[PDB]
């Protein structure tokens with residue numbers, strides 16, 4: 268893998284673009300796997316994770332499957348204490364009904380199901396257990412403090428953390444080949460493609476996971492371009508509740524970076 272090589276020009280334009288937006292606080296990290304071209308604009312800063320933390324939790328899930336601690340077909344119970352509002356379909360089912368572990372893990376990601384997330388976190392031994400695993404993978408600022416939906420934003424991550432975990436997964440670390448490919452398939456079938464994917468050119472693919480708690484919006488993943496290049500991408504923006512400028516800034520930066528990598 269080539270050395271990290273900042274595109275100093277393009278970084279400056281992106282910083283100029285974020286810093287002229289008053290009530291927005293942005294952090295982002297991008298890395299090109301072929302050139303080593305990198306972009307870091309507040310990429311190491313800590314943010315409320317919102318639902319972006321569901322990506323690290325999915326990694327933890329498949330790690331457990333790899334290690335024989337969890338099975339894809341075992342039945343998980345939707346206990347009252349795990350039922351959660353906001354995004355998800357499980358919450359409308361009978362309390363104490365049960366679901367295949369894999370089905371639950373998929374819902375956590377595809378539709379950001381918060382009940383499903385709580386079920387997985389609990390099954391994997393709880394937040395502390397997961398936090399330790401995140402630390403082991405090098406995720407310095409990725410921490411579960413509260414169950415989902417965690418609308419207050421107590422759960423933390425960083426753009427570098429999200430992008431770096433994805434780099435690792437993309438390069439075949441952490442997870443087995445079978446679990447990796449399952450994870451990427453799930454992460455290509457999310458229903459929210461309004462952020463990073465909205466700035467990509469025709470024929471690009473992206474495995475990613477968005478997060479939105481109104482006061483914070485973000486997205487992270489891995490992009491394959493039609494030209495053959497691959498890069499990882501993560502951006503988080505603090506905003507006034509549901510400010511459409513926050514989501515638009517992510518598009519804009521996504522577009523800027525995609526086009527720069529087309530030209531080079």
Ligand SMILES: *C(=O)[C@@H](NC(=O)Cc1ccccc1)[C@@H]1N[C@@H](C(=O)O)C(C)(C)S1
Nearest residue numbers: 317318353354379416459477478479480
């Ligand atoms: C993760 O942050 C999730 N958000 C919620 O559960 C609360 C919420 C609040 C206001 C609007 C929508 C949701 C789910 N994941 C985000 C995301 O993936 O960006 C959704 C908008 C899909 S809800």
